[PDB]
Amino acid sequence: DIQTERAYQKQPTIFQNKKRVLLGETGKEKLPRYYKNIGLGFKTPKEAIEGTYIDKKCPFTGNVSIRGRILSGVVTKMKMQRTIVIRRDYLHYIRKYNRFEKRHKNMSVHLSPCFRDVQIGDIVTVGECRPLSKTVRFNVLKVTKAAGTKK
Amino acid sequence: AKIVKPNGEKPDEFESGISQALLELEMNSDLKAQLRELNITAAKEIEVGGGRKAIIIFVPVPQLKSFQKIQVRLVRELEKKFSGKHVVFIAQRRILPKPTRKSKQKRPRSRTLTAVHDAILEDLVFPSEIVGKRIRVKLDGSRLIKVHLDKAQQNNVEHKVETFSGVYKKLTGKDVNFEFPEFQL
Amino acid sequence: ARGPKKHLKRVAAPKHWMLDKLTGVFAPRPSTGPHKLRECLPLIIFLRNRLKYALTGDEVKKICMQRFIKIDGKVRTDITYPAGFMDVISIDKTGENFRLIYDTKGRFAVHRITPEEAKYKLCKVRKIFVGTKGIPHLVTHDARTIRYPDPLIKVNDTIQIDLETGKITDFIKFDTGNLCMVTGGANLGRIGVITNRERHPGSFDVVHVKDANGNSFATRLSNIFVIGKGNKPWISLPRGKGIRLTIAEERDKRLAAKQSSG
Amino acid sequence: VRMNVLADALKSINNAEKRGKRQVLIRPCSKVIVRFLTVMMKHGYIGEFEIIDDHRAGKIVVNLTGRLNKCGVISPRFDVQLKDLEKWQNNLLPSRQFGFIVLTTSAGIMDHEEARRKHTGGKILGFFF
Amino acid sequence: GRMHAPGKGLSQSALPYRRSVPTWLKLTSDDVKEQIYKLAKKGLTPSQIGVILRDSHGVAQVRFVTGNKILRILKSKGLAPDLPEDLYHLIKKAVAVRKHLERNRKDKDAKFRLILIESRIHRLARYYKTKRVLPPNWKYESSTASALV
RNA sequence: UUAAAGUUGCUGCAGUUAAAAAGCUCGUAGUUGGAUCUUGGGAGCGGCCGUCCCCUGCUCGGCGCCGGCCCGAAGCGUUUACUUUGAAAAAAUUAGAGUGUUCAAAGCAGGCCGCCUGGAUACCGCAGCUAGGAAUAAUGGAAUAGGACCGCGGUUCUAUUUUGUUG
């Protein structure tokens, strides 16, 4: 499932190549995991702790720093791999005609693979990080489900 | 004894005496087979404007329909064992506050305060079913509800409308008057 | 541009430098120093427009080549040396010392001090640095690197240095209930007591300072400055004692003084 | 369809006072309608009214006097502040000595002098003079 | 007025303000529930169940003699139809007008009414997709018209 | 080019006959959407009423006492708009304080016989941060009950002041 690619994927902090004694079972073949806390009152999911995936652009299990602005939005498409696109909606004011303006603009957000129950139409909270690509400047921190889906 | 409270506290002298009085009232009558599971929760003693008194008796909701068809008798064994104390039956109901954003199940709309007040008013007197309701809002800003009752069984309710107004002003606080319309039926 | 900016116009100057508008096209840009470009007071404008010792910009550089002006006890020959907040200016010839404390309005004001007050100077530490082989360092707001303080020094608390040796004598802990100085922004030059501090993670923290007469205001945490333990200061306050009285009360006291003077 | 019960209510009471009637019926009810007539009743522009408590939506029998001139509704409910209320009062009241602006603030629904006293703003409903 | 007609009609029921069980009714809730179960095993739409119960058994409404409405008991027992009543009748009317229009190619009025029936079917389908009653993949076509009764 | 122009009308225009309702209907985007969820008082004050105190809950510690009372805190309570306050928001220009450039446009000076001082204040559309209210408008619960509380039964890793110096 992992290392389906010509370049090896590994975490650059945990040394996985220590010396073993009995060279078998009974307390071994359990890889240690590296994680960290983002802060700002956020919670690290257990799927990023007990997970097995390798991703350097993950905010929790990776070399990604979170600072700056905190936003929110609703997703539209999951087509490109490991990055999603969300839609943000806001009300603009016009000074001449004393009314309001509903407009939108969308942005590309990197999605960590620790969320696997994500679907169309749920409100997600994103955070500012480093420029990871040309159009990618945000990362997914927590996911709140949409209205309904009781079963 | 016959009194059962939802909370573990000891009742006073008055409601214990009313529970005992109804205990011999169901003992000496032919209704002992019809009150085996029918109990009392709480009772009070308040006053009405004038030279009369009143008593209120609380009944739980899922046994209320048992007491609806026995109330037409039970009240006048209570005035034939008392001197002149008029006896009414009401159904108890818990009230919940509106959940604000400053402060969990969704509160069902049966616990709505206006619905509780409406249920208290309609179940306060059973045989005179309500056929009309108007609200007088006088120039001081206060509300004065007037409630129209049934044309039938008028004679055995008209002597207790002052007691109904007194107990509704005591439990809730609304000036409620009663009228008997004759136009419709 | 193609490099660093080097000139400075008259109206590009900050308002607290507070010059006129028609005497030239250029204003004195200060040289690089311990303070920022915006909140500093150059030597040339001070000697030319505050004490009125000199009238022309060649006379002040003649003073600086005559070696009569010392900032923090060392002779400064720079004519545009930025003398910022909480600095002592000592003149060896006439024998008076000046300390720059903001008054009740947003500008620098003269404050004649005793020589016994003129041997120390307060500083605010910006960050704590641990050195090569575990040397505790200092980063003050006046760019003074001090080695090995007392180990109770934190990010926000202020220190007292001795001008001759450059070492800590005593420090004031940043707690709620200490005397306050505000430097920067709108509320600039008000004496009060720190009451409440709230933490905002990911953004700037804001404090709440209550003045002696009961007035309260809020400033950012980066623009705070502690001057005293409790309500007792460690320096000499200027006139007015940092109140920021309203313009109606200022009008009342000005008309009362004018009526009494006659 | 019916998209604003309050505009229809105030139009109906305006037509009733313009013809010269004494009692009128308003087909729907709302809490905001009862607050609006409570403001005009406290200010003495309408008489003592009633609520026909029927199980659909209350019908309101308002006693009409000759003290009313015009009742109007601004649609939609425009946001108004303390600094922007004077323009509304200038171009919408007939005079500075009488007339009231009914605006919904967070502390209830009442006239604009009381909201000036409590220093609060909100959304405008209508006017009467 | 109407939704695809110029008429403005006022003809519907008017339930009284009184909301109590009358004294002449000598029935319980379980008896009328059993009657609903038997008449639903007879296989009839819930509206006409209400018609027959009101006509024969003297009950005004089930919801004033039982604490809940008739389709809710029909779903609680587990014999309510999967498709709603009005949607099923609209699809049946669409099937009828399409079967009429196969043998009559020149009936333009029937084609216009078929357009109106299809529009009302779509507008009800949007609401039933919104309220999570019907699956999102259910689509209305002519070829699925005869397949879905 | 602006006002005049209510002849570009958001405030604030007109469409039977003067300029102007698509031949008619369906229909996606857009805009707008019925009613209803907590109402009422108390101890006071001046001769029925204005202002004011009250109708949010579980791990640490000081205005105070003899493990018991209360108060205060590192940490938490559905989110939006709107409403009010606070921070930051360059100067000049605009309003505007003081001031006999002979007055004034201008300037920031100047006045007392070494001294006293000014060189303010306000606005800065929207968007971003923060704290009081929840009226107004939209979103949500629990209904095929894995619904909310309460004491009881098991599947795994570990807190060392707690099994005499050491396996």
Curated annotation (Swiss-Prot), chain A:
Lipid group attachment sites (S-palmitoyl cysteine): C58
Broad class of the protein's primary localization: cytoplasm
InterPro entries: NA-bd_OB-fold, Ribosomal_uS17, Ribosomal_uS17_arc/euk, Ribosomal_uS17_CS, Ribosomal_uS17_N
Keyword Transport attached: no
Alphabetical UniProt keywords: Acetylation, Citrullination, Cytoplasm, Lipoprotein, Methylation, Nucleus, Palmitate, Phosphoprotein, Ribonucleoprotein, Ribosomal protein, RNA-binding, rRNA-binding
GO MF term set: rRNA binding; structural constituent of ribosome
Stored Pfam families: Ribosomal_S17, Ribosomal_S17_N
Location of the protein in the cell: Cytoplasm; Nucleus, Nucleolus
GO cellular component: cytosolic ribosome; cytosolic small ribosomal subunit; nucleolus
Modified residues (Citrulline): R20
Modified residues (Phosphoserine): S65, S108
Post-translational modification comment from the UniProt entry: Citrullinated by PADI4.
Residues with the N6-acetyllysine modification: K36, K43, K56
Residue numbers of Omega-N-methylarginine PTMs: R67
GO biological process, one term: translation
Subunit and interaction comment: Component of the small ribosomal subunit. Part of the small subunit (SSU) processome, composed of more than 70 proteins and the RNA chaperone small nucleolar RNA (snoRNA) U3.
Entry's family note: Belongs to the universal ribosomal protein uS17 family.
Name of the molecule in the record: Small ribosomal subunit protein uS17
Taxon lineage: Eukaryota, Metazoa, Chordata, Craniata, Vertebrata
Curated annotation (Swiss-Prot), chain C:
GO biological process: translation
Glycyl lysine isopeptide (Lys-Gly) (interchain with G-Cter in SUMO2) crosslink residues: K229
List of residues that carry N6-acetyllysine: K232
Keyword Iron-sulfur annotated: no
Domain S4 RNA-binding: 41-103
InterPro entries xrefs: KOW, Rib_uL2_dom2, Ribosomal_eS4, Ribosomal_eS4_C, Ribosomal_eS4_central_region, Ribosomal_eS4_central_sf, Ribosomal_eS4_KOW, Ribosomal_eS4_N
Chief location: cytoplasm
Compartments, as annotated in UniProt: Cytoplasm; Nucleus, Nucleolus
Keywords: Acetylation, Cytoplasm, Isopeptide bond, Nucleus, Ribonucleoprotein, Ribosomal protein, RNA-binding, rRNA-binding, Ubl conjugation
GO molecular function, one term: rRNA binding
Keyword Transit peptide on entry: no
GO CC terms in record: cytosolic ribosome; cytosolic small ribosomal subunit; nucleolus
The family this protein is said to belong to: Belongs to the eukaryotic ribosomal protein eS4 family.
Functional description taken from the UniProt entry: Component of the small ribosomal subunit. The ribosome is a large ribonucleoprotein complex responsible for the synthesis of proteins in the cell. Part of the small subunit (SSU) processome, first precursor of the small eukaryotic ribosomal subunit. During the assembly of the SSU processome in the nucleolus, many ribosome biogenesis factors, an RNA chaperone and ribosomal proteins associate with the nascent pre-rRNA and work in concert to generate RNA folding, modifications, rearrangements and cleavage as well as targeted degradation of pre-ribosomal RNA by the RNA exosome.
Protein name: Small ribosomal subunit protein eS4
Gene: RPS4X
UniProtKB/Swiss-Prot annotation, chain D:
Cellular location(s): Cytoplasm; Nucleus, Nucleolus
Domain of life of the source: Eukaryota
MF-aspect GO terms: structural constituent of ribosome
Pfam families: Ribosomal_S8
GO terms, biological process: translation
N6-succinyllysine modified-residue sites: K87
Cross-referenced PROSITE patterns: RIBOSOMAL_S8 (PS00053)
Cellular component, GO annotation: cytosolic ribosome; nucleolus; ribonucleoprotein complex
Signal peptide residue numbers: none
Entry keywords, A to Z: Cytoplasm, Nucleus, Ribonucleoprotein, Ribosomal protein
UniProt key word Ribonucleoprotein: yes
HAMAP family, A to Z: Ribosomal_uS8_A
Annotated family: Belongs to the universal ribosomal protein uS8 family.
Subunit structure: Component of the 40S ribosomal subunit. Part of the small subunit (SSU) processome, composed of more than 70 proteins and the RNA chaperone small nucleolar RNA (snoRNA) U3.
Stated role: Component of the small ribosomal subunit. Part of the small subunit (SSU) processome, first precursor of the small eukaryotic ribosomal subunit. During the assembly of the SSU processome in the nucleolus, many ribosome biogenesis factors, an RNA chaperone and ribosomal proteins associate with the nascent pre-rRNA and work in concert to generate RNA folding, modifications, rearrangements and cleavage as well as targeted degradation of pre-ribosomal RNA by the RNA exosome. Required for proper erythropoiesis.
Protein name: Small ribosomal subunit protein uS8
Organism: Oryctolagus cuniculus
Curated annotation (Swiss-Prot), chain E:
UniProt keyword terms in alphabetical order: Acetylation, Cytoplasm, Isopeptide bond, Nucleus, Phosphoprotein, Ribonucleoprotein, Ribosomal protein, Ubl conjugation
Record's GO cellular component terms: cytosolic ribosome; cytosolic small ribosomal subunit; nucleolus
N6-acetyllysine PTM sites in chain numbering: K26
Protein name: Small ribosomal subunit protein uS15
Origin superkingdom: Eukaryota
The protein's assembly and partners: Component of the small ribosomal subunit. Part of the small subunit (SSU) processome, composed of more than 70 proteins and the RNA chaperone small nucleolar RNA (snoRNA) U3.
Location of Phosphoserine modifications: S29
GO MF annotation, one: small ribosomal subunit rRNA binding
Function summary: Component of the small ribosomal subunit. The ribosome is a large ribonucleoprotein complex responsible for the synthesis of proteins in the cell. Part of the small subunit (SSU) processome, first precursor of the small eukaryotic ribosomal subunit. During the assembly of the SSU processome in the nucleolus, many ribosome biogenesis factors, an RNA chaperone and ribosomal proteins associate with the nascent pre-rRNA and work in concert to generate RNA folding, modifications, rearrangements and cleavage as well as targeted degradation of pre-ribosomal RNA by the RNA exosome.
Biological process (GO), any one: translation
